[PDB]
């Protein structure tokens, strides 16, 4: 950006800032402000329908900066269904100021993450919150009676996992209560309060929580807490994940990881 400063000083400057965007899925859109698409470092940035709003919010993070960048929705670059899916949610966009006059000088104006997303019939508004804002969300590190093991296999949990987890294919598409096949009766009720990551389909390992796993005819009907993101077709592969109630007793019955038990029950 030093040469970019020089370009401004000379006055021979053409703005080609490219708002490269990496979504939660990891797909990348160059989105350059310049009307002629520029490949900077091998990355074409789309001239078409690139959100402008270049100044937006520009503090140094003392104030978390949400760069409001309402942009014309480009179906090709951005999909409404994906926005609804949330693939676009939590998308980190690195705004690099580049010059058409010189591709070599790229200085990142800011690192931003879309935090607030809004939609319109043909256009959309995005608030590009800075990393401090996400960092500033409070976790609280609560310590309490129930196992805080939570998701199994985490570094704190040190869960062996392994054999209990099983993979199944959906036999019937019932939205939240889809019936699946390839799951044993024993497997059911161990996947209760678990997840059903869908290898098959758009989810690609994204799983709605299984509120209830109940054995039925033709495999286990799985009642998810919520309807699956994307319409899940029957026959889509899913990896059922063992669900622990994370009660000290439940943790003990299922795995008995005394060394790693995060449930401090008595007082």
């Amino acid at each position: 950006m030093t040469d970019y400063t020089d370009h401004l000083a000379t006055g021979c400057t053409t703005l080609a800032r490219c708002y490269i965007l990496t979504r939660r899925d990891g797909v990348v859109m160059g989105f350059t402000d310049h009307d002629r698409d520029i490949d900077l470092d091998g990355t074409r940035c789309a001239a078409g329908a690139a959100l402008d709003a270049s100044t937006a919010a520009r503090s140094l993070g003392i104030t978390p900066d949400d760069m409001d960048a309402g942009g014309a929705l480009s179906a090709d670059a951005i999909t409404e269904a994906d926005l609804r899916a949330g693939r676009y949610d939590g998308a980190q966009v690195e705004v690099w100021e580049v010059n058409w006059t010189d591709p070599a000088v790229r200085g990142r104006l800011g690192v931003y993450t879309i935090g607030q997303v809004e939609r319109g019939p043909l256009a959309f508004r995005a608030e590009l919150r800075t990393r401090p804002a996400l960092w500033n969300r409070p976790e609280g590190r609560i310590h309490t009676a129930l196992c805080d093991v939570d998701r199994l296999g985490d570094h704190r949990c040190k869960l062996a996992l392994g054999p209990w987890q099983s993979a199944a294919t959906v036999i019937e598409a019932d939205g939240a209560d889809l019936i699946v096949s390839g799951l044993d009766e024993t497997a059911s009720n161990i996947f209760d309060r678990g997840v059903l990551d869908w290898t098959g389909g758009a989810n690609a390992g994204t799983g709605s929580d299984i509120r209830v796993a109940r054995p039925v005819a033709g495999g286990v009907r799985v009642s998810l807490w919520s309807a699956p993101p994307f319409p899940i077709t029957a026959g889509d592969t899913a990896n059922a994940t063992v669900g622990c109630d994370r009660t000290a007793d439940t943790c003990r019955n299922r795995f008995d990881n005394l060394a790693n038990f995060r449930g401090f029950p008595l007082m």
Partner: protein, 214 residues
Amino acid sequence: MQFIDVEFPRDIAAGCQAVLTRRDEVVTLASGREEVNSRWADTRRSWDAGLGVRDEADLAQVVALFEEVRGRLYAFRFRDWLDWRTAATRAPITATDQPLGLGDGSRTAFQVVKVYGAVNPYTRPLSLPHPGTVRVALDGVTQPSGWTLTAPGGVITFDTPPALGVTVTAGCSFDVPVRFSDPELAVQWAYFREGQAGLAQAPSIPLIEVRLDP
């Protein structure tokens, strides 16, 4: 709906404005990027009337007529000179001039449709075919009886559906539906009596061709 059919006098129509109203544009970024929004069912027309009134008595008649609908109740029948001729102002409209469509052996009903443009024509169904200008034609011969024309509908129904391969061609004058844009009407009448005046051009009467939702 049923609507109302009330004729707008042709002489008053002689003194009337014509402006084409079209929608569906809403383009995108001004980086040379264009997106075509689709409003749907557009191509209405805009008119300003009262320039054809001629005299005080006639002016009274249109005013009374506006009062009759009490503010555009339902539909209003407007004679559109431009759409009246399916052919040309100097050329007689014929059944053959406008092509309704082709019967498939099950196509009993054909709405009168005005096709405007060629490669990607927009077709406008006509709510009211002017009576007596409606002629039905078939590829073999001009078609006479057995076609049931719904004057409010604009649909002509062959009792026996035309078989595949016969072109239905119908050309008729267009009595277009209109809804007045503004309730307020300016009155220019010129006081009569000793002055004995009267005015030929009442101003500011605004009407919009209305594509009625059926």
